[PDB]
Amino acid sequence: SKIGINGFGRIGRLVLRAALEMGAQVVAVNDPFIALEYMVYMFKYDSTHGMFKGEVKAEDGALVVDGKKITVFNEMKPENIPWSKAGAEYIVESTGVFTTIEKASAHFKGGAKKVIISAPSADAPMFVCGVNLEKYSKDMKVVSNASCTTNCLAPVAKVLHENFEIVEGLMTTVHAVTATQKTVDGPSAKDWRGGRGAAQNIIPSSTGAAKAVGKVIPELDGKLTGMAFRVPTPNVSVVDLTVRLGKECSYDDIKAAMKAASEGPLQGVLGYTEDDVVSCDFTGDNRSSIFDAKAGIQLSKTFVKVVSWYDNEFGYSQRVIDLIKHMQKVDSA
Amino acid sequence: SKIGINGFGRIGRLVLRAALEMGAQVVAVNDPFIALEYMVYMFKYDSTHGMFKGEVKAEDGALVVDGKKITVFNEMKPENIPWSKAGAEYIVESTGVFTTIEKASAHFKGGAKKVIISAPSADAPMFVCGVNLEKYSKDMKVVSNASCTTNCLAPVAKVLHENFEIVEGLMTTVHAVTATQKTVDGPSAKDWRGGRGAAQNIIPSSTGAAKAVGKVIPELDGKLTGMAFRVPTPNVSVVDLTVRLGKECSYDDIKAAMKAASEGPLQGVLGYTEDDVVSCDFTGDNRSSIFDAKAGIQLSKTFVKVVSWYDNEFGYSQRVIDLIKHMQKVDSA
Amino acid sequence: SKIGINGFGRIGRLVLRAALEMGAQVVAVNDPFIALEYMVYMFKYDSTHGMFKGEVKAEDGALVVDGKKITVFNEMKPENIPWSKAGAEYIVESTGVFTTIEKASAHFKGGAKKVIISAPSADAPMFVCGVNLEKYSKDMKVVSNASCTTNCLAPVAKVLHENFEIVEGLMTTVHAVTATQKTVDGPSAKDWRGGRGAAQNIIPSSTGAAKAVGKVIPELDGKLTGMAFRVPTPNVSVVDLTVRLGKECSYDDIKAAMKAASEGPLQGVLGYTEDDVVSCDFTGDNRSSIFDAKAGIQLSKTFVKVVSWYDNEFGYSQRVIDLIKHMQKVDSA
Amino acid sequence: SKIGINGFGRIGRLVLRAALEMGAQVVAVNDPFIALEYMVYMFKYDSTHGMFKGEVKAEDGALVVDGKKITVFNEMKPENIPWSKAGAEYIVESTGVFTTIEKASAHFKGGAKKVIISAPSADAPMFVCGVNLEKYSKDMKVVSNASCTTNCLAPVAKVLHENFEIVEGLMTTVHAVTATQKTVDGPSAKDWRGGRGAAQNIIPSSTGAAKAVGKVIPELDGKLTGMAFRVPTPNVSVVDLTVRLGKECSYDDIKAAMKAASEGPLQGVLGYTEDDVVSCDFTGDNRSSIFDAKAGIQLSKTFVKVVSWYDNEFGYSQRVIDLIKHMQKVDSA
Numbered sequence A, B, C, D: 001s002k003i004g005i006n007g008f009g010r011i012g013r014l015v016l017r018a019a020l021e022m023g024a025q026v027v028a029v030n031d032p033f034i035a036l037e038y039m040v041y042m043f044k045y046d047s048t049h050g051m052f053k054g055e056v057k058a059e060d061g062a063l064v065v066d067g068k069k070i071t072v073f074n075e076m077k078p079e080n081i082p083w084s085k086a087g088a089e090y091i092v093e094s095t096g097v098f099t100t101i102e103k104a105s106a107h108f109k110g111g112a113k114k115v116i117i118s119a120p121s122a123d124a125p126m127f128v129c130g131v132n133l134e135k136y137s138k139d140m141k142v143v144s145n146a147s148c149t150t151n152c153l154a155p156v157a158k159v160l161h162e163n164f165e166i167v168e169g170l171m172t173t174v175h176a177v178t179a180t181q182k183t184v185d186g187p188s189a190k191d192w193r194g195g196r197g198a199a200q201n202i203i204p205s206s207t208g209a210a211k212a213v214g215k216v217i218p219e220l221d222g223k224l225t226g227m228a229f230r231v232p233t234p235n236v237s238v239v240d241l242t243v244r245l246g247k248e249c250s251y252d253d254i255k256a257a258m259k260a261a262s263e264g265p266l267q268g269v270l271g272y273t274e275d276d277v278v279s280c281d282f283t284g285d286n287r288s289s290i291f292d293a294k295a296g297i298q299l300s301k302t303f304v305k306v307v308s309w310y311d312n313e314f315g316y317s318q319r320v321i322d323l324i325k326h327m328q329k330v331d332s333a
């Protein structure tokens, strides 16, 4: 397994949690802003996901989580991380700042084998587990796991497209706050709305998902786009997809198609519920997309609104580990 | 004017604030749960809209707001409210619990002339200022001012339909919390999602707008429906309308048409902005619907997503005074 | 064990969770506002404490949780609950509405043996596990488990008093929202501040703890009082106790005394931490009181501020089960 | 007046709003992170205090607010700000990062006459209006207006000390979130509790007030200290002061003394209320400290808890204009 993590943030830390849950091996973490003793504290306590049940301590300049020793670096520059000292070969690139092939390829200076960007990439091939993993090939050295919204949207869009044909769709994500937002009104020069106080406001915003699903399901390129409203919750978001369909159908056919896929090819990626759920019901949910049967509405035989929940931190971090596992099987690693 | 208010809640008090701003005359308030000394405090201090600038005191069993004496009653059953005795003939029925014609008609027993339900009604004719006021018949004794969402959606839907034709549409409102929600998970037997802790959750809910807009614009009956997500903000909501249009157009045509209507026939009802606004920017906004030019997205020549803001408490309260003014002209009063 | 629960609210439901965790047996639940199918949903999903991991279903008009069948009643009046049909003998009185001996004794009409009020009582003897359980005697038929703040304060006050003498103290609880609070400004006639919108405000409020610790530790009667600020969090609260002490001491002596008690006589009731904890770190914490070593300040040898955390829902519900277990040992039941 | 603002943040902008209300003259603003077109948006729209009523536009490289041209600069290093060229001689240093005399003195390089740090200083003399302004020496080139908490605490502590003598006291401020807090758990290396998600948590923190009040009232040096809990509100905080008094008194004496000071020497600095107020009632409040008569508690003749509110953004911003006005009189300017 031999995973390294660059950026021990919300996703960096929860990928480490997901790796331990899945028996994957992380050997090295890099973050210039989080010293080793502070890394112990940040991994141990999580306001959203609860205290890590397990021993976490610093020992001999390494982070030790349940007996596994994780080498810690504190390099500002990715090209200076000595990944090969720790034996890290598959690097999770989770800073937010090194998303292109050019930028992510800095990790090959330290001896990394493969880099997985935990965000959309302008040029690295993008993957959503359950949707297009079979297009991965072992010569791809830098890949992307797309965004949390793309991972919720792409499963549901795949089911709708295979069964009924998406002629065109528009989506909204009602989206929890992230680390890029601000506690009170402050400077966000490249996104003025995103600078307004996160706890006070519904904030219109862009979404990664819009473009990205057109690269993940190329048949849908240019037939889907959408936007986000950031709202004052700390985690868990919901896709609200309005689609026009090519084939006439009832809402029962939509539900039966989603149910059948969640039991078979999309098992573990797409969930299905008919309960009266609210967003707190998905905190810590492992799935990429949970179809909410009761919340959706069909106006006519070809125009419908479908609602699907995702823990944007936790479900995504579990898919990073799923993607790395797939890549190492194909690579033989 | 000779307005009485039944139910001195969020809408009841802000209707009095709006009447004061618009020089309307409120002569009587009734609320069994809010004794006179408490009405002073409740009217003076408001967490969302700020302290009432001006004098509120109790004298002689009356609420005296800026010189005006308002007779206070504390009746549980509307039958027993002496409206006659205070001279209240136009009754704002803002309790939430007497919405049908037969239930609202109880105010006639104490000599009310007309009742205005401040919510959708199963059978009282619904009006939205700027959209269908000319349907108001002088012989209508119980009318409805529809919901906060219908008052936002109907202006924008009017413009789109007149210019481009709405073939079908689906709406979401991302809606602030209201008084029927719960601070922590508790019993809401008729709406199980709506009982979950309001501050913790994105909560799927129904919208009044779903029924009402096909009544207010009858040619759109059956062509439009939608749902709500309640999110943890205290006030100000946003309509997200995804429409399939009859006529090919660009997004510039949609903008130009909304700008022209806000300057002309829909002036004061529909507003227009191109600023990078967020929900807090509309707290205290007088308009029913404020079109957000920059947040909308056109996918194709006939498929588009339009975003409009509304202060669900305040814009609505001002519309209730507008409705009464219009009714009084038609009745001659 | 043979526990019945009256009021299946935040405390009613979490006492059921605590009973299952501790292997205690609940046989009957009464709530007139929550029908059986709705009880399934409310027990299964918890916005604060996460989904119940376990099977919950309605079967043959009973609630079935992990194989245990729990008879459900829906009586408005406590004297009409046929507790003996279900074999319920120890009743948790968790409505909030039947707190005196007179009111709580209604349950003896249905065949209850003992009633435990999950709130301060004006006359029923009040108990805090770890502090005064040894004053319980088997002839006491109605008892109280005091409030969540009293359960946090009393352990810490006991340690300080035994070691250093409390001459006098004043406390504040910075306290999460409860079900008595309101989503937006509405009527709370007996507590005007408590009616103001809970998510918008710091709200000064009274506390149960103030008086109650004087009944639980009678040596401290009249030497302690205090108040609450309700703040916009959904659970977890913190006591901030300013004490003048009879014996001169350093902060190290305070910490060593708290540490020694958390390892011995107060084990499981009083916790001890020296980490940089925040309130989310205590969600689901079992203890009544967790001393925060780093947050406290000693101004002089006899004047100090001590800070102690408590999950006001969860820690309290576990103490209800602890108190019932103690009572059945003393009663032989 | 000839005021320049360095750092157009929460305090920098509200200081300009306060200068406009008080007819002070701001001539220049500097912020490297906020370009002129963005300064218009940031000044016009405010989530906490509402939209600026009046004209804000950019013309010719200047910010024009109600007719006034303000020269805008975008310098990173204060040394390089041409204050001379705009005529700015009294500089509000509101960046948060140039708080020491030597760091603040950089503004003299571009011809500033005086600097006012809008935060406590390790060595610049601190002033609180109404408490120690007469200590201001004309030869003081760098002064401090202390923190929002010192400006609340010092007026109330002055009154108590003058009338009853403070023997020792311990304070807590329940403090709104600020810009140094984080929207979700993230790195705050110097304050680990302060990095945890602001909207989710009660967070123990330090207070500026702890140091500063013994400097502002030197006879209370060593007799007073305290701490903060940061809670999820956007603005408005509350001091909770527990004091041991030298002279026996009743709570009526404390009330009478606070009322007399707010009418006389501390008028406009200290306010007094007996209403059932909550934090939202003070948003936009001009005063430094508003004594809450009803929330305080006296335990004995010498031991009492006093509660005072403050709008930490707005009251403070107005005090900065007061301080500059006073300094200009003493300097003759």
Ligand SMILES: NC(=O)c1ccc[n+]([C@@H]2O[C@H](COP(=O)([O-])OP(=O)(O)OC[C@H]3O[C@@H](n4cnc5c(N)ncnc54)[C@H](O)[C@@H]3O)[C@@H](O)[C@H]2O)c1
Residues within 6 Å of the ligand: A006, A007, A008, A009, A010, A011, A012, A030, A031, A032, A033, A034, A075, A076, A077, A078, A094, A095, A096, A097, A118, A119, A147, A148, A178, A179, A312, A313, A316, D185, D186, D187
């Ligand atoms: N938050 C979510 O729900 C979520 C989900 C999926 C994807 N993402 C994506 O993952 C990335 C990180 O997001 P996040 O939410 O974890 O943010 P975050 O701010 O919590 O984490 C970023 C981390 O990277 C560290 N860092 C910054 N510069 C570094 C550098 N030069 N070298 C190494 N480490 C550095 C920071 O200290 C921080 O700990 C982004 O691209 C984001 O869009 C976020």
Ligand SMILES: NC(=O)c1ccc[n+]([C@@H]2O[C@H](COP(=O)([O-])OP(=O)(O)OC[C@H]3O[C@@H](n4cnc5c(N)ncnc54)[C@H](O)[C@@H]3O)[C@@H](O)[C@H]2O)c1
Residues within 6 Å of the ligand: B006, B007, B008, B009, B010, B011, B012, B030, B031, B032, B033, B034, B075, B076, B077, B078, B094, B095, B096, B097, B118, B119, B147, B148, B178, B179, B312, B313, B316, C186, C187
């Ligand atoms: N809150 C909004 O944004 C909004 C906007 C538009 C319309 N409305 C509608 O207005 C109505 C009231 O809503 P609200 O937000 O003001 O709720 P609310 O709870 O604030 O007010 C309801 C008021 O009615 C009073 N009341 C209850 N029974 C009474 C009775 N028998 N007689 C007289 N008064 C009584 C209550 O004491 C309370 O003060 C609802 O139908 C709601 O759908 C609400």
Ligand SMILES: NC(=O)c1ccc[n+]([C@@H]2O[C@H](COP(=O)([O-])OP(=O)(O)OC[C@H]3O[C@@H](n4cnc5c(N)ncnc54)[C@H](O)[C@@H]3O)[C@@H](O)[C@H]2O)c1
Residues within 6 Å of the ligand: B185, B186, B187, C006, C007, C008, C009, C010, C011, C012, C030, C031, C032, C033, C034, C075, C076, C077, C078, C094, C095, C096, C097, C118, C119, C147, C148, C178, C179, C312, C313, C316
């Ligand atoms: N919330 C906490 O942190 C906490 C902690 C300790 C103690 N308490 C106390 O426990 C009691 C309940 O508090 P809560 O937070 O669970 O409130 P809650 O509102 O969540 O629960 C009250 C429950 O009692 C039910 N009920 C009302 N009348 C009834 C009746 N006539 N018969 C039977 N059931 C009825 C309601 O439907 C509701 O489900 C109060 O006395 C409260 O002060 C609360």
Ligand SMILES: NC(=O)c1ccc[n+]([C@@H]2O[C@H](COP(=O)([O-])OP(=O)(O)OC[C@H]3O[C@@H](n4cnc5c(N)ncnc54)[C@H](O)[C@@H]3O)[C@@H](O)[C@H]2O)c1
Residues within 6 Å of the ligand: A186, A187, D006, D007, D008, D009, D010, D011, D012, D030, D031, D032, D033, D034, D075, D076, D077, D078, D094, D095, D096, D097, D118, D119, D147, D148, D178, D179, D312, D313, D316
């Ligand atoms: N927020 C409050 O309630 C409050 C009240 C009183 C005092 N203060 C103090 O005022 C100071 C600023 O606080 P704030 O709340 O306004 O924070 P903030 O983050 O809103 O504002 C800081 C501003 O300084 C700017 N800045 C950063 N570096 C700069 C530089 N090198 N030159 C010029 N400008 C630069 C930033 O762009 C930002 O706009 C702090 O010292 C704070 O403690 C805050």
